[PDB]
Design a protein around this ligand. Sequence first.
Ligand SMILES: Nc1nc2c(ncn2[C@@H]2O[C@H](COP(=O)(O)OP(=O)(O)OP(=O)(O)O)[C@@H](O)[C@H]2O)c(=O)[nH]1
Ligand SMILES: Nc1nc2c(ncn2[C@@H]2O[C@H](COP(=O)(O)OP(=O)(O)OP(=O)(O)O)[C@@H](O)[C@H]2O)c(=O)[nH]1
Ligand SMILES: Nc1nc2c(ncn2[C@@H]2O[C@H](COP(=O)(O)OP(=O)(O)OP(=O)(O)O)[C@@H](O)[C@H]2O)c(=O)[nH]1
Ligand SMILES: Nc1nc2c(ncn2[C@@H]2O[C@H](COP(=O)(O)OP(=O)(O)O)[C@@H](O)[C@H]2O)c(=O)[nH]1
Ligand SMILES: COc1ccc2c(c1)NC(=O)CN2c1nc(NC2CC2)nc2c1CCC2
Ligand SMILES: [Mg+2]
Lengths: 123, 425, 431, 424, 427
Amino acid sequence: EVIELNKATSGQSWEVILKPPSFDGVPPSLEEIQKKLEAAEERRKYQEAELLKHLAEKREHEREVIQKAIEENNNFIKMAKEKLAQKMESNKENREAHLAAMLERLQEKDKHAEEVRKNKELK
Amino acid sequence: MREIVHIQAGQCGNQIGAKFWEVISDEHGIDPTGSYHGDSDLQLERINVYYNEATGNKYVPRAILVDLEPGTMDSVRSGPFGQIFRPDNFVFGQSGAGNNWAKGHYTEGAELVDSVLDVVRKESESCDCLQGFQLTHSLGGGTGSGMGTLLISKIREEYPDRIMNTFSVMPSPKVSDTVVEPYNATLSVHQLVENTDETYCIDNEALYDICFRTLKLTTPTYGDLNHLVSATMSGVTTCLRFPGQLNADLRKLAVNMVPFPRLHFFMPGFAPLTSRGSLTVPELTQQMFDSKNMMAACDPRHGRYLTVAAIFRGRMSMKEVDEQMLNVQNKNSSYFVEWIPNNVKTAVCDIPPRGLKMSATFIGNSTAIQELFKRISEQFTAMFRRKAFLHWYTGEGMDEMEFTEAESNMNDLVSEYQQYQDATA
Amino acid sequence: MREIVHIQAGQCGNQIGAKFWEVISDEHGIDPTGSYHGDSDLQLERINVYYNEATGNKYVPRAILVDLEPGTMDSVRSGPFGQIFRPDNFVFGQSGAGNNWAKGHYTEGAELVDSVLDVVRKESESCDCLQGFQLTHSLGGGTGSGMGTLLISKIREEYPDRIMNTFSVMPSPKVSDTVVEPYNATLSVHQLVENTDETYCIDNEALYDICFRTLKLTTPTYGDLNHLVSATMSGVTTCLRFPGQLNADLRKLAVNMVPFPRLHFFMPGFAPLTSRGSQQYRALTVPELTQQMFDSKNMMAACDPRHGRYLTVAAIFRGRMSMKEVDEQMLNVQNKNSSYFVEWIPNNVKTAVCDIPPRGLKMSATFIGNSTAIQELFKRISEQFTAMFRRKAFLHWYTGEGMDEMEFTEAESNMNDLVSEYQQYQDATAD
Amino acid sequence: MRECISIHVGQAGVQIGNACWELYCLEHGIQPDGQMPDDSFNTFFSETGAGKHVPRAVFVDLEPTVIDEVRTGTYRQLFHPEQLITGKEDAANNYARGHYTIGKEIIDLVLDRIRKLADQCTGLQGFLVFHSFGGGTGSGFTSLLMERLSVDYGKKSKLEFSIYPAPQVSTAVVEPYNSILTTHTTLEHSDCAFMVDNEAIYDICRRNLDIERPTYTNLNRLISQIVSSITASLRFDGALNVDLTEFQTNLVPYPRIHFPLATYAPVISAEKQLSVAEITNACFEPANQMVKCDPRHGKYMACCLLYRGDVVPKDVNAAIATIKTKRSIQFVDWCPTGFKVGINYQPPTVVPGGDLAKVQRAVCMLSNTTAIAEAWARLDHKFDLMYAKRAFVHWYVGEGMEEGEFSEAREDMAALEKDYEEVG
Amino acid sequence: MRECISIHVGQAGVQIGNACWELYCLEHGIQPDGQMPDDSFNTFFSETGAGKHVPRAVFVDLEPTVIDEVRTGTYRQLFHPEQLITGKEDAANNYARGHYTIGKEIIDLVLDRIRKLADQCTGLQGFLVFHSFGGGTGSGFTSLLMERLSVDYGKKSKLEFSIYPAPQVSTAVVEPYNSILTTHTTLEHSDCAFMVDNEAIYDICRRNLDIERPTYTNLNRLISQIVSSITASLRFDGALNVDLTEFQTNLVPYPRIHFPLATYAPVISAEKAQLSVAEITNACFEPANQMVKCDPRHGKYMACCLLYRGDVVPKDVNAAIATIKTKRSIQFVDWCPTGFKVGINYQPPTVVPGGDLAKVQRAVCMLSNTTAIAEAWARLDHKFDLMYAKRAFVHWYVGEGMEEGEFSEAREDMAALEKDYEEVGVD
Ligand SMILES: Nc1nc2c(ncn2[C@@H]2O[C@H](COP(=O)(O)OP(=O)(O)OP(=O)(O)O)[C@@H](O)[C@H]2O)c(=O)[nH]1
Ligand SMILES: Nc1nc2c(ncn2[C@@H]2O[C@H](COP(=O)(O)OP(=O)(O)OP(=O)(O)O)[C@@H](O)[C@H]2O)c(=O)[nH]1
Ligand SMILES: Nc1nc2c(ncn2[C@@H]2O[C@H](COP(=O)(O)OP(=O)(O)OP(=O)(O)O)[C@@H](O)[C@H]2O)c(=O)[nH]1
Ligand SMILES: Nc1nc2c(ncn2[C@@H]2O[C@H](COP(=O)(O)OP(=O)(O)O)[C@@H](O)[C@H]2O)c(=O)[nH]1
Ligand SMILES: COc1ccc2c(c1)NC(=O)CN2c1nc(NC2CC2)nc2c1CCC2
Ligand SMILES: [Mg+2]
């Protein structure tokens, strides 16, 4: 069954029906789009803000490290300074005491000489 | 996505970076005065990804040169193409790094870094649209690894939206310059895992093994190693420098090659292998799987490829190449992952490398790369179990906690590469 | 560490002191006028150690001459080189000490001692860098021993940081018949143990034995003996007087030779042995000199070195000879004779060579030993002491001048203590 | 007038746009400078006060090298700068960057230039959208545009010609992701979507045209002949498919099932005349379908035949009668078993110097078969292979997409395939 | 930039300074006036405006004899007179006199002169300190100086070149007391100490050079060649350079284990009538050419630094190094995967004319940290215990203010150190 449809200057159309149908009959707003786009931007910016935050934490660790080593040097210097001043003072005191002892025994001896010269006069 | 800012740091960083510019200036037709006189325009179409145009019809590499030691860059200035670099892109301190990561990353590196970042900032602002950064450095030394990973972190803070790409040379006891290579490399891999987008693993172990075994050189020298690296660096940047149908850039490379953000370490490959001085397409295809042709010391048939990029250079049939690539993938089905379909992209580019008619270059994301890290891990633990040389790092302010977190991280990356090696469909 | 101040006290002190100054003067090319007439700058290099530089390019011995008896000063001024001495460094008194330690140490000697200290103050303040003092004296008499040890301790009191060094002549009944010499010697030894850093032990017994046995002089005089003393004093001060590879000074000797403060009495030895003014018709070989140096006959203390062990040895060879051959034979004697060196002081034998020989000898050697065998000398003194003191013999010569029996008893046990610690270390094991 | 506006999105969308407008200009006698020596062409070409005929078209590619082809091309004079929209960075093969990052930045600009072309329309029918499934601009920006067009131009028609990804010639491993993402997001907002399987087109060029390694331009030339035949009766005064709503009425009985299968013949190499009955036999060969699938695995819902050139109605029905006897063509039960036919007399035109040969007659068959659901099954599987391990998801998420959108889109595609099976 | 201050202490330190600075002048072409007809010599030579090049050095001695020879010698004009510091009295071989009694009277003067040398530096690497172990100044004044340098300059690098005592050439019997005392007090203050055994130098000059009885000038001029190899990497621009920090980092696995073992080759007689890179490298691991007497075959290597000079190409070094790591006789520790550091300077070794060494094209000096050097500590410790068991000579130190406690503490620290060299060699 051929059923003519239309005709025109550059065209002609029709319809060919071999077998009829077995069964009769047939069995977002602009705000929502803008909200969904702005939301994807917000979480995009949030993850970028997290990345710089963890990167900024790294900068502070780096300063803490440089600081620690400066504190270590200064504590090495101070410990060496107190070690040396303690040793040099103990050594001076020890040396001065040995020399004091050496002169005191000799002086006890020259006291004995005055005592020996006294006994001679006595008799 | 046009301009790449290139950075080299430390001795190795600067030695291989110099041969890189040496090589690709020969390809694009640039003499050391900065004048151009090749014979094709395809050599100039995308030459602005690596060169700035000076007004005097000159071309100046977009290349920043860094060291804590003055000696190495003075050797570059006097090397062959030292004339070509912008003279004010040389940023050098003078106390050196003393082979110490903590000195390059914390104290001496901090005091030179802002001077480097200022040179980076001025090359960036003369860029119409900045694609990202390519860095060349060693991991075993003090400067390229300590100061390099510091540079990386601070570029990522100023440019979080730009791709970060490193050529990272891996140490081997087979060609060593310092006894603390395991500490430097392992503290640096921790950084790289977390702060780069693509890293090509240049293994000094694989370089040496290739020169000694395939190239039959009795005693390899750094020049022999750097001849391999220069051929590799030329091969992997081919699609960025010469126009092809793919219009490749660093962000698309990272998107198609990196299925998981931590797993961004690549096995480079090259064929044919050539010595300084001195072939068929089906065979060029096969050297993809030859561990003898790999620049990381890893056997690809020990794991699986997540993704693969292959560049074929020279005059050759894009039909014959595509046939042999698919035949390889079908025959070696078991060594690609099932859960990433069509994971091997091939570009063919007519321009051949110098002294060669036909070459192929392979970029692989293989779970086999865990072997490189397991070997660095074992060397690290052999020393750190005894705290050998640890006091030089603690003296610079580092806690020893940073050491354990850096290997516990690198062991995690190894188990993560293993986890996907066993993953099925 | 350059200048030394020299003191000589009493008869023995001034006579061996005199001969020392004659001998080193000839070595240093100085005539009695004080003028240099030698041929080598080496004679002048270290001349500041013993001589003050003077007007007229003269040289005057940094020397102080002391005696309670006025006669010895005239004998020195009459002696050859008597004019070389500064005339104001002659300190003399009215009467001798009558061979009485207590007279020299306590009564008459104490009157003169302040005057001596004045001359010493001058000579030592004129010094750039004062090493310290050397004293020559006897221990048997009364002045050199009693005023000698008084002087020592008084100098100690003013100059406690300088080295105190003595040449001390030990008495022997072979050479003097004066019976109280064991007392004077045991008194002096007390003061020396306490107040000097180095004492060379010059034993009259050893000197007489050498002259009688090796020099066949039947009746030796003080001139026969003093030739042996003068040779030693030249030999042990060679390395102060002449430039060498080590810049020896008195303190470096004390530090390397005296392992314990009290054990500072050295046994000196010399080879070859000769008679005074006697042409030497042939010198000796280096191995000869080496052997004959650890030979009991060549010792200036009457002790057999093979009867104890050396704590430390220093050896000076003089003449033109191969330092190779010297260190050779020297090591040989150490290995063959290892039982006589203490094991627990390593490398305890140091030797030097000086190209300049003494007058009349082509080659000589000189030995400074710290041997425990020196206890023999002190035992001999202690025995003679006890023999007399058991009987309280002559004790009123000393109590009359003010002393007490206790001071005697003390100086004897102190010497005996000295003997016993020389023994302690002689029997001491490394294990 | 019955005006239609063309929008071209991404590299595939733009380079195919050039091949179509080039073909249109040859079919209507428009030279490259714009001058022209039936007024139906005016539906696709405005006119300037200078006498030049300007395509009613917008090109959107955020990579300037592709637009630079248009503005420096042979037909550069035709286009006005306000029609070409470009940017700095492209979507990096990432739908999410195309839809969310870029799209927030350029959507108003793009809609603005579109509004300028519609103000020059006395009776606008709707839009023809050209884009890829696989590119990040073709998938991500196109889907946002279609949402916005459905808001801004309510009851206006929206046709798409979508390049369907082929692994042979494709650029990215994430093309299955972008395909299922854009399809989910476009489904409610498209009235008729003709898909083009790059592998189907590739296979046709190699076998029929004797090209061993076809270029993008060989595919695009062949695609233009298909696009031409579909649009021929809008640009001439034909009889079948004379306005855009008639496509939906003749081919989309169910709104979600709006993906027809195009079949074309004859494809004859230039290096080398067929009858009406043989070109008609060729329309029932799977070898000439634009999308790879087997129409025996499905029933038809509609079926139109678009003849071009020298073809006579008696010959056509004669060719149709031969097919009923020997072949079986099962329609759904609720639809009539039969065809709509149009002849447009204007002869099929080739690009001179190309690899397609001038022929006297041709035909293009459009049919809505449940077999097309096999195309969506193929992509569905690659999607699941990769999404199971969450491979490459973080790139999309990093652009501000939510993971759940992957799952939402996949379930819609499951729903679609069930819809296709229920009707079949 | 990158300047190093050299400090020479006591007789041994000063006499070696003479041989070294003499050699430096010849290696850079500096006349004894300091004028000369590669600006790397600036690390050790400041410059006054007249073009005079003045060493960055202070010579210190407690006695004026040795330093008066420099003041009157060939290089009297080489130095400013304020760099040549002397007192009047030496330490009479007594640590306690070098560290306290005599030492304290000149320490302030020396630090002021050091401070002024540091003012002429823009990138000070650190200090090299030359001294004897056995001398009373070499020991006690260096300790005092090290302690005072750590207060003035914190953790700034301090490296020693130390003479280890020998019987043949000793000058004092208390030398083991001086050695143990200064080692205890200096240990905390020195980043790295290069030890030189006078006995080993002596036996080399006798076997390799055929000098029957070597003088100090013989010993010292061979010791100079070694020091030059170490510092050439700082005084010259070569292919592979090693600065001071790279020395400490690559040779010192633990702060106390900081006593590398020096070796040098070739040592050949000038009169006798070339050697390859391999031959001189193999010769660094033979015990004959060691600078300290010990058996490395009975020890484990923890770090080997090889410093080549002259006509030496990097390929032939790596070939020579390849052979070395195949020798089972050469054993490294478990915990050392990478043990080698290599530098190469290209100016041949310069020989003082009228000297006994021959001019060679290529030579090498290796520094290796082996557990074998503990044998040398064991030998000193035993001489110390012999004397200390009887308190021999101890009164001399007590008299200068020390306490016996300092002796035992120093010996106990040496005992720990001996035990530390044991622990690090465990597998
Ligand atoms: N070797 C040596 N011994 C001497 C010499 N003169 C005296 N003696 C010894 O010295 C001891 C006595 O010492 P003197 O020198 O006479 O005593 P002094 O200190 O001068 O005191 P006085 O004469 O009593 O005023 C005896 O043992 C003598 O043998 C001498 O010239 N040479
Ligand atoms: N038929 C045809 N297909 C093409 C053409 N260009 C690209 N394609 C296909 O389109 C898919 C990729 O889509 P494109 O439109 O090129 O991507 P894009 O959106 O412009 O680029 P990006 O922003 O980098 O993602 C792949 O399957 C390509 O093979 C073309 O000119 N013709
Ligand atoms: N190689 C060498 N060793 C020397 C030299 N001088 C001394 N020694 C050694 O140094 C140790 C003695 O130390 P000295 O340096 O002479 O003593 P000092 O530091 O000057 O200290 P005092 O003289 O006690 O104030 C012994 O082992 C000597 O062999 C020398 O010139 N060269
Ligand atoms: N392949 C290669 N590796 C090198 C080169 N130079 C140094 N290396 C390696 O770099 C590491 C030492 O790093 P280096 O660059 O010298 O140190 P830095 O200047 O402190 O950064 C070791 O693993 C060496 O093997 C070179 O030119 N080529
Ligand atoms: C047991 O070992 C030693 C023994 C002696 C000495 C030394 C070590 N070392 C020294 O530096 C001081 N010294 C000496 N001192 C003096 N002083 C002059 C006053 C006699 N003469 C000599 C020597 C040795 C030769 C003659
Ligand atoms: Mg001295």
